[PDB]
Amino acid sequence: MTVEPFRNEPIETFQTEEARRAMREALRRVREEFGRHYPLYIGGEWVDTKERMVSLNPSAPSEVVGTTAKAGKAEAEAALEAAWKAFKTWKDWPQEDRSRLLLKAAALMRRRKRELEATLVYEVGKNWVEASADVAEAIDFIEYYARAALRYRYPAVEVVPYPGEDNESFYVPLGAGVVIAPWNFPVAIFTGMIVGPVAVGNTVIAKPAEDAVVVGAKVFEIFHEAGFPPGVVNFLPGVGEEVGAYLVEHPRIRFINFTGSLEVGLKIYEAAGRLAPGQTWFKRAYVETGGKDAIIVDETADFDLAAEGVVVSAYGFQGQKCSAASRLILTQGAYEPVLERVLKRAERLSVGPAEENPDLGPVVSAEQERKVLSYIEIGKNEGQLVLGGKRLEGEGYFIAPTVFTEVPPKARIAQEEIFGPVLSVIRVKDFAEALEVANDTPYGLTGGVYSRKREHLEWARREFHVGNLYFNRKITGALVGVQPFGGFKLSGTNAKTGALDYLRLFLEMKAVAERF
Amino acid sequence: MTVEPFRNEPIETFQTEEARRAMREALRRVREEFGRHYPLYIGGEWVDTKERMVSLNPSAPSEVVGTTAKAGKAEAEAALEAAWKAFKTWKDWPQEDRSRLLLKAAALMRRRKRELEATLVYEVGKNWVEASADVAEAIDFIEYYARAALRYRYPAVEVVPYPGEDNESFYVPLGAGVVIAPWNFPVAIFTGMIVGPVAVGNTVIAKPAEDAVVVGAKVFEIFHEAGFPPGVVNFLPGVGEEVGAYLVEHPRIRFINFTGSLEVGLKIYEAAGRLAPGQTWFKRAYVETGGKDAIIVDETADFDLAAEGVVVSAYGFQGQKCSAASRLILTQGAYEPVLERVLKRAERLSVGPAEENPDLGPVVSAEQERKVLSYIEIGKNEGQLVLGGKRLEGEGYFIAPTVFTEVPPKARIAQEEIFGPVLSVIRVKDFAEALEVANDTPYGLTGGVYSRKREHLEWARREFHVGNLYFNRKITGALVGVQPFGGFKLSGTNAKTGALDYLRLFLEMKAVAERF
Ligand SMILES: NC(=O)c1ccc[n+]([C@@H]2O[C@H](COP(=O)([O-])OP(=O)(O)OC[C@H]3O[C@@H](n4cnc5c(N)ncnc54)[C@H](O)[C@@H]3O)[C@@H](O)[C@H]2O)c1
Ligand SMILES: NC(=O)c1ccc[n+]([C@@H]2O[C@H](COP(=O)([O-])OP(=O)(O)OC[C@H]3O[C@@H](n4cnc5c(N)ncnc54)[C@H](O)[C@@H]3O)[C@@H](O)[C@H]2O)c1
Ligand SMILES: CC(C)[C@H](N)C(=O)O
Ligand SMILES: CC(C)[C@H](N)C(=O)O
Ligand code: NA
Ligand code: NA
Known part of the structure; x- marks a missing residue:
């Protein structure tokens, strides 16, 4: 043949x-x-x-x-x-x-x-x-x-x-x-x-x-x-x-x-x-x-590129991907500039019936909606809610793009797969601590790093222990x-x-x- | 390098x-x-x-x-x-x-x-x-x-x-x-x-x-x-x-x-x-x-070559091999000529202290001796003892090369891994039945066919369901x-x-x- x-x-x-x-x-x-x-x-x-x-x-x-x-x-x-x-x-x-x-x-x-x-x-x-x-x-x-x-x-x-x-x-x-x-x-x-x-x-x-x-x-x-x-x-x-x-x-x-x-x-x-x-x-x-997949961003990254890739990775198909970025790990110098950009981009996302080609359609079922909303309630007592966290009006299972920040690495919402449009932002000192936090889950599916520093990229290649790792791009959509x-x-x-x-x-x- | x-x-x-x-x-x-x-x-x-x-x-x-x-x-x-x-x-x-x-x-x-x-x-x-x-x-x-x-x-x-x-x-x-x-x-x-x-x-x-x-x-x-x-x-x-x-x-x-x-x-x-x-x-x-490994011999085979390969395969290291021939499946035309040759060869095998380079040393332990002797007792109830079946004199765990004939394919000695010098001989009508009997165990490790007929060898290549199959040679000693x-x-x-x-x-x- x-x-x-x-x-x-x-x-x-x-x-x-x-x-x-x-x-x-x-x-x-x-x-x-x-x-x-x-x-x-x-x-x-x-x-x-x-x-x-x-x-x-x-x-x-x-x-x-x-x-x-x-x-x-x-x-x-x-x-x-x-x-x-x-x-x-x-x-x-x-x-x-x-x-x-x-x-x-x-x-x-x-x-x-x-x-x-x-x-x-x-x-x-x-x-x-x-x-x-x-x-x-x-x-x-x-x-x-x-x-x-x-x-x-x-x-x-x-x-x-x-x-x-x-x-x-x-x-x-x-x-x-x-x-x-x-x-x-x-x-x-x-x-x-x-x-x-x-x-x-x-x-x-x-x-x-x-x-x-x-x-x-x-x-x-x-x-x-x-x-x-x-x-x-x-x-x-x-x-x-x-x-x-x-x-x-x-x-x-x-x-x-x-x-x-x-x-x-x-x-x-x-x-x-x-x-x-x-x-x-x-x-x-x-x-x-499943996974509990993280994107790390350090202070050397293109912050606009990072924010776009994080939003695609976290909210694509409502975060209902085993590859979805559910954790955003930001070094001290990246924290404010990246979070501000992610929040600005995410607050602009449209949500509605899938036939309308919105940025987000609904989550898949009443049970999924229940589980995601439940994790949101959990998250409210673990980290700081800074965007969304609500069911939207309507018969369909519409959940707003959600962001928690200052999330403890060991928090339930930082460890357990929520499988909805819920991003947990974790603030760390440096790239070394970013890698420690990235690796400290039971999972190891996808991960990403936004950084211009070659030595940080190549370090992650060796030590960010996930099966599918991506640099300066989205962590979903493996071809x-x-x-x-x-x-x-x-x-x-x-x-x-x-x-x-x-x-x-x-x-x-x-x-x-x-x-x- | x-x-x-x-x-x-x-x-x-x-x-x-x-x-x-x-x-x-x-x-x-x-x-x-x-x-x-x-x-x-x-x-x-x-x-x-x-x-x-x-x-x-x-x-x-x-x-x-x-x-x-x-x-x-x-x-x-x-x-x-x-x-x-x-x-x-x-x-x-x-x-x-x-x-x-x-x-x-x-x-x-x-x-x-x-x-x-x-x-x-x-x-x-x-x-x-x-x-x-x-x-x-x-x-x-x-x-x-x-x-x-x-x-x-x-x-x-x-x-x-x-x-x-x-x-x-x-x-x-x-x-x-x-x-x-x-x-x-x-x-x-x-x-x-x-x-x-x-x-x-x-x-x-x-x-x-x-x-x-x-x-x-x-x-x-x-x-x-x-x-x-x-x-x-x-x-x-x-x-x-x-x-x-x-x-x-x-x-x-x-x-x-x-x-x-x-x-x-x-x-x-x-x-x-x-x-x-x-x-x-x-x-x-x-x-x-483990295995319960068979050699098939049909009426087209070199009977002397087959008998030598069978004896090597069955009694090499006292049959204590996962690859050992523990079943000998003979078609009608092969039955008498091959069995007579196998018996003649096996009866000449020496057994004694391993350092003297006998054909057979002892089985490895008192427990193994007990296991093999217990299977010999079971065999006496299922088939016909025609050679050996006895402990030999000395403190060492010497067991004679043993042959049972007229063994039913579903007999315990035809199904269970004995891991000793015990060969079970099974008579079948033709090559098709030989393959049926060969395949009808829970195991599938080694197997052998002695035959000059190309169509029988190539049929076995496709259908004798063992991981290691050997034609016109011993079935032990994979290199x-x-x-x-x-x-x-x-x-x-x-x-x-x-x-x-x-x-x-x-x-x-x-x-x-x-x-x-
Ligand atoms: N690693 C990957 O490639 C990857 C890709 C896509 C999805 N996922 C994971 O899939 C999950 C979401 O999918 P889901 O909700 O369909 O998962 P699920 O485990 O609830 O169900 C998956 C399939 O298993 C069936 N199932 C449920 N219980 C079963 C049981 N006890 N025995 C046999 N089958 C059973 C379901 O009917 C369904 O067909 C997420 O955790 C996600 O991470 C992983
Ligand atoms: N498929 C092959 O490549 C192959 C090759 C050689 C031998 N074998 C098999 O080996 C067997 C003979 O060897 P054996 O008597 O040493 O096997 P065995 O199963 O009695 O013991 C093998 C090993 O497992 C250990 N063991 C025993 N019980 C255990 C337990 N419950 N948990 C963890 N380990 C345990 C033993 O101490 C030993 O180290 C035969 O069945 C033979 O077919 C298979
Ligand atoms: C099918 C799915 C897992 C897709 N290939 C992704 O990486 O997002
Ligand atoms: C080690 C052992 C399994 C050997 N290779 C054999 O086939 O008899
Ligand atoms: Na449906
Ligand atoms: Na010993």
């Missing part, structure tokens, strides 16, 4: 009339389709259930974006049977054939990109550019993994020769596994976690997050149209603690690919270490969990291929997505010697 | 007068030192304890071959402090400097190979060639990992460029971990599991098996002379379920590298999946466990570099030793972007 070198899918900014027109039409058609029902997808067919999952518009939660079927244990069992049956033959497809199937799925997704973006707008309250970045990242995962998988093809392993023998080592896929996905990047992360394993010959049962079931179904429409053989990919919208846990704990699930909260990731990793009755392997579990994504510590297992190494996680190696 | 391309250390056959003379000298030196006490090695110094571990000669168990100190929880804590203190600077050594240190250790080990082999003979009952293969493999791990580590050096990761930015991804070591080692290859596996992680910048607390504490101490003499910085490698002989479990469960242990029984591997993997109080990472655990070693299913986590991939298991990746 020979294709053009990988390039990232451009993120639409909607600055041309042509792009606005296309997006307006896409939003109109998605809105016109509110209330549609999407079944499960098991063994190559759409399968309905009596029970359903309801997906609300967080900008106007009286509105039902759509419903899906709901998978329980019986549907999990049907999906397992379909996936294992498919694995038997899918594993034997030449890699080039599997990679071409991914490339077809990528082409179909690209052709439906405005529709998928519009679905994210309505279903999870992304503004237009956040929706565009999500979809472009999904396309990037497909394009990237399609190509990366060829690097593992038979027989890929470099071995030392031996006289009178052929020695051949090669990779094989593991089997049928479960993918359990978050609501915050429900096209990008959902797609990536599915297609990586599938590319190299595994089969997958995919469990979308409850708040993002409709867009998960549209991804499955694409998979079905592309023509993945029956059983290779299966779609099981349902309750995480029910069908999700059932699959995690099952003796016949080979691997678990999870992205989500630390709380859930911990349970999954523990469960994966147990031998379920009748289980005949050691389960692999990849868990990519597939460019920035292998994944963290340290309680940010997860360091499964680097959008990197060659990712696919090795879903392979095992055989070594076969023939003595002639 | 530029060194000669990797080659495997030649295994001494002792066919020359000089080699025999050298072995006799080494045996004499080692036995003159049977009085020796070997302390713990913690933070660059030998540290003694009140309590001790005693090591016996399994060929003459009234003879003590040495004693060592005995690590408890306090010594585990001391080793942890030392290993984490050392990690802070050892991680920052240029890879070339760490690799040179391993190369020095390999040179020192090679200079002491006869002494090490003689220690294996007396301490764990290896005959001369089994001892030589063990030491040569340890040397190989050091030479191979020294070189392989350079493939990961800063900045090793292939990433996609982005305009106006430097994007740099690179590997870093994980931290301090525990290595828990078996008695059956107590130079090779002990050395490999330590030096792989250490090569790329980790530090290690090593817990040798109780039956092989003395030879483990001698490996540490080599590490000390090579000049590993204090705390980089630590030696903690002690009780598995005490000090071993304490380290496995510890919140400050970053990774576990284990080779041993399934029973213990299951406990370790389960424990590793738990977040210990105060733990701030997801532990990595690599567990390489570093040549045959990446590690299995499927309950044979462990497929951490392929003696392969480039091994070192990646002890690394995490950081991605650092600078926007100019």
Whole structure:
């Protein structure tokens, strides 16, 4: 297979009339389709259930974006049977054939990109550019993994020769596994976690997050149209603690690919270490969990550039990113100039229904709103509230951009992942103390430094202990291929997505010697 | 660093007068030192304890071959402090400097190979060639990992460029971990599991098996002379379920590298999946466990070649190998010709004190003797005893080469790892049924096929589901570099030793972007 070198899918900014027109039409058609029902997808067919999952518009939660079927244990069992049956033959497809199937799925997704973006707008309250970045990242995962998988093809392993023998080592896929996905990047992360394993010959049962079931179904429409053989990919919208846990704990699930909260990731990793009755392997579990990500700014930085990057990092998609800047660590000389600029920029941010393309749409659900507002109340007794801290008026789950300052490094709001538009500003003496504070959390996902001092940058390169570190730019929006994504510590297992190494996680190696 | 391309250390056959003379000298030196006490090695110094571990000669168990100190929880804590203190600077050594240190250790080990082999003979009952293969493999791990580590050096990761930015991804070591080692290859596996992680910048607390504490101490003499910085490698002989479990469960242990029984591997993997109080990472655990390994012979095979390979595979080091052929699966046409040849060959095998270079020495301990004899009793109830099945005269734990025939595929002796000189012979209709029987165990470590039929060999290449498969040769003695070693299913986590991939298991990746 020979294709053009990988390039990232451009993120639409909607600055041309042509792009606005296309997006307006896409939003109109998605809105016109509110209330549609999407079944499960098991063994190559759409399968309905009596029970359903309801997906609300967080900008106007009286509105039902759509419903899906709901998978329980019986549907999990049907999906397992379909996936294992498919694995038997899918594993034997030449890699080039599997990679071409991914490339077809990528082409179909690209052709439906405005529709998928519009679905994210309505279903999870992304503004237009956040929706565009999500979809472009999904396309990037497909394009990237399609190509990366060829690097593992038979027989890929470099071995030392031996006289009178052929020695051949090669990779094989593991089997049928479960993918359990978050609501915050429900096209990008959902797609990536599915297609990586599938590319190299595994089969997958995919469990979308409850708040993002409709867009998960549209991804499955694409998979079905592309023509993945029956059983290779299966779609099981349902309750995480029910069908999700059932699959995690099952003796016949080979691997678990999870992205989500630390709380859930911990349970999954523990469960994966147990031998379920009748289980005949050691389960692999990849868990990519939260962060409490900091940007450090020292007195040498471009303060205007820093303030802009902090505001993008903290408030992009309402701070509902594992990569979001939730801590701003300012050295003494940076404190006043940077905080003043951040406050000035943040107070200008618009908040409203996502379809209007505001700076911030709503948070995703009533439960998320409750948790964020609760953390705001906690924060009021830990640090100094200097901006926002309020729910805004309206049916949708609108929360104002919020800033606390003089926050103690050990405060709950400086340690725990809030996952909302809440920035905690921490004042430190110097760059050495900035690094100490940056590192002193249980997490290690993303981080940033704004500084012109080469020695501070290079020190952070060595010692700011996060998996994804950025200098003089935003700490969100890691690009597939460019920035292998994944963290340290309680940010997860360091499964680097959008990197060659990712696919090795879903392979095992055989070594076969023939003595002639 | 530029060194000669990797080659495997030649295994001494002792066919020359000089080699025999050298072995006799080494045996004499080692036995003159049977009085020796070997302390713990913690933070660059030998540290003694009140309590001790005693090591016996399994060929003459009234003879003590040495004693060592005995690590408890306090010594585990001391080793942890030392290993984490050392990690802070050892991680920052240029890879070339760490690799040179391993190369020095390999040179020192090679200079002491006869002494090490003689220690294996007396301490764990290896005959001369089994001892030589063990030491040569340890040397190989050091030479191979020294070189392989350079493939990961800063900045090793292939990433996609982005305009106006430097994007740099690179590997870093994980931290301090525990290595828990078996008695059956107590130079090779002990050395490999330590030096792989250490090569790329980790530090290690090593817990040798109780039956092989003395030879483990001698490996540490080599590490000390090579000049590993204090705390980089630590030696903690002690009780598995005490000090071993304490380290496995510890919140400050970053990774576990284990080779041993399934029973213990299951406990370790389960424990590793738990977040210990105060733990701030997801532990990595690599567990390489047992096998129930089969050789298939069909009616097209060279029956004499097959019989020789089977006897080597089944009874080499008394069958106390995770790779040992414990099942012999014969198609109808192969059954009589191969079984008659195997019986003729096996009945000629000598058994006695290991230092006399018999075909078989003793099993390693009174406990192993009890286990093997108990399985022989079970076997008498499940199949037909046709050879051996008896303890042999003398204080040493001598057990005759044993063959059961007409063994049902689901018999305990056809399913459970006996780890002694006990071969179970299974008659099957044809090659398809042979593969079915081969695959139907909880294990998947090694396997073999004797056959001249190309289609049967290539069918097995695709479908005989073991990590290390061998055609028309013995299924034991995997060579570093040549045959990446590690299995499927309950044979462990497929951490392929003696392969480039091994070192990646002890690394995490950081991605650092600078926007100019
Ligand atoms: N590290 C990363 O790459 C990354 C990326 C995106 C999001 N996240 C994390 O995701 C979190 C927000 O996502 P979320 O709210 O969907 O997370 P969540 O943990 O609440 O749920 C994630 C998924 O797990 C399922 N689930 C819930 N309980 C389960 C259980 N006991 N067993 C099996 N499955 C279960 C849910 O139904 C959902 O599909 C944040 O913490 C964020 O940091 C991390
Ligand atoms: N897969 C492989 O590469 C491979 C290679 C060699 C040996 N083995 C296996 O090794 C086994 C024989 O070795 P063994 O008898 O030394 O194995 P074992 O499991 O009894 O002990 C192995 C090591 O673990 C320690 N240990 C025992 N209980 C422990 C506990 N609960 N927690 C932590 N550590 C504990 C022991 O003290 C020893 O150091 C066989 O099953 C064989 O198949 C596997
Ligand atoms: C998907 C998400 C984690 C995105 N790649 C980011 O870094 O913000
Ligand atoms: C050390 C041991 C596992 C050896 N390499 C073998 O295959 O027998
Ligand atoms: Na929704
Ligand atoms: Na001994």
